[PDB]
Amino acid sequence: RGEVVGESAEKSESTATFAPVTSLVRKVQVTQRFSQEVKWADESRQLGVLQT
Protein backbone atom coordinates (compact mmCIF):
# COMPACT_ATOMS: atom_id res chain seq x y z
CA ARG A 1 0.00 0.00 0.00
CA GLY A 2 0.89 3.68 -0.49
CA GLU A 3 1.30 5.99 2.55
CA VAL A 4 0.57 9.76 2.65
CA VAL A 5 3.48 11.67 4.31
CA GLY A 6 4.46 15.22 5.37
CA GLU A 7 7.66 17.09 4.46
CA SER A 8 10.14 15.58 6.98
CA ALA A 9 7.65 13.01 8.37
CA GLU A 10 8.92 9.44 9.03
CA LYS A 11 8.12 6.92 6.22
CA SER A 12 6.77 3.36 6.76
CA GLU A 13 6.96 0.04 4.81
CA SER A 14 4.15 -2.17 3.46
CA THR A 15 5.22 -5.21 1.45
CA ALA A 16 3.60 -7.94 -0.64
CA THR A 17 2.96 -11.23 1.19
CA PHE A 18 2.93 -14.60 -0.58
CA ALA A 19 1.98 -18.20 0.22
CA PRO A 20 2.29 -21.56 -1.61
CA VAL A 21 -0.61 -23.90 -2.48
CA THR A 22 -0.10 -27.58 -3.45
CA SER A 23 -1.73 -30.26 -5.65
CA LEU A 24 -2.84 -33.72 -4.56
CA VAL A 25 -2.22 -36.80 -6.76
CA ARG A 26 -5.15 -39.19 -7.45
CA LYS A 27 -4.71 -42.59 -9.15
CA VAL A 28 -7.96 -43.93 -10.65
CA GLN A 29 -8.41 -47.48 -11.94
CA VAL A 30 -11.23 -49.47 -13.57
CA THR A 31 -11.23 -53.31 -13.52
CA GLN A 32 -13.88 -55.41 -15.34
CA ARG A 33 -14.02 -59.21 -14.67
CA PHE A 34 -15.69 -61.82 -16.98
CA SER A 35 -15.73 -65.64 -17.61
CA GLN A 36 -13.68 -67.13 -20.50
CA GLU A 37 -17.12 -68.42 -21.64
CA VAL A 38 -17.94 -64.74 -22.49
CA LYS A 39 -14.76 -64.38 -24.60
CA TRP A 40 -15.69 -67.57 -26.52
CA ALA A 41 -19.32 -66.46 -26.97
CA ASP A 42 -18.34 -62.99 -28.25
CA GLU A 43 -15.51 -64.14 -30.58
CA SER A 44 -17.73 -66.87 -32.12
CA ARG A 45 -21.04 -64.92 -32.44
CA GLN A 46 -19.45 -61.43 -32.96
CA LEU A 47 -21.45 -59.69 -30.15
CA GLY A 48 -19.00 -56.77 -29.61
CA VAL A 49 -19.35 -57.14 -25.80
CA LEU A 50 -15.56 -56.96 -25.29
CA GLN A 51 -15.27 -53.88 -27.57
CA THR A 52 -18.13 -52.04 -25.78
Binding site: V5, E7, S8, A9, E10, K11
Partner: protein
Amino acid sequence: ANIPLTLIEYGDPDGSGDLQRKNELAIRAEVVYGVGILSTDAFAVVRDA
Protein backbone atom coordinates in the same frame (compact mmCIF):
# COMPACT_ATOMS: atom_id res chain seq x y z
CA ALA B 1 43.43 16.17 1.36
CA ASN B 2 40.18 17.53 -0.12
CA ILE B 3 36.62 16.12 -0.50
CA PRO B 4 34.79 18.52 -2.91
CA LEU B 5 31.08 19.34 -2.37
CA THR B 6 28.97 16.14 -2.45
CA LEU B 7 25.39 14.91 -1.91
CA ILE B 8 24.67 12.36 0.87
CA GLU B 9 21.39 10.42 0.39
CA TYR B 10 21.59 7.58 2.99
CA GLY B 11 22.08 7.01 6.72
CA ASP B 12 22.22 9.86 9.24
CA PRO B 13 25.31 12.08 8.70
CA ASP B 14 24.48 14.57 11.54
CA GLY B 15 22.21 12.83 14.16
CA SER B 16 18.77 14.29 13.18
CA GLY B 17 17.37 10.96 11.80
CA ASP B 18 17.83 8.81 8.69
CA LEU B 19 17.83 10.63 5.30
CA GLN B 20 15.73 7.90 3.64
CA ARG B 21 13.38 7.64 6.66
CA LYS B 22 12.63 11.40 6.84
CA ASN B 23 13.03 11.95 3.05
CA GLU B 24 15.80 14.53 3.35
CA LEU B 25 19.09 15.25 1.61
CA ALA B 26 22.40 16.57 2.91
CA ILE B 27 25.36 18.26 1.20
CA ARG B 28 28.89 17.97 2.61
CA ALA B 29 32.20 19.62 1.84
CA GLU B 30 35.39 18.80 3.70
CA VAL B 31 39.09 19.72 3.67
CA VAL B 32 42.06 18.93 5.91
CA TYR B 33 44.67 21.64 6.53
CA GLY B 34 48.20 21.22 7.86
CA VAL B 35 49.14 24.34 9.92
CA GLY B 36 52.34 25.41 11.75
CA ILE B 37 54.02 28.70 12.80
CA LEU B 38 57.85 28.79 12.55
CA SER B 39 58.21 31.55 15.13
CA THR B 40 55.54 33.53 16.96
CA ASP B 41 58.04 36.47 16.91
CA ALA B 42 57.51 36.74 13.11
CA PHE B 43 54.14 38.40 13.98
CA ALA B 44 52.87 41.42 15.89
CA VAL B 45 49.25 42.35 16.75
CA VAL B 46 47.39 45.62 17.27
CA ARG B 47 44.55 45.25 19.80
CA ASP B 48 42.40 46.94 22.48
CA ALA B 49 42.13 45.24 25.90
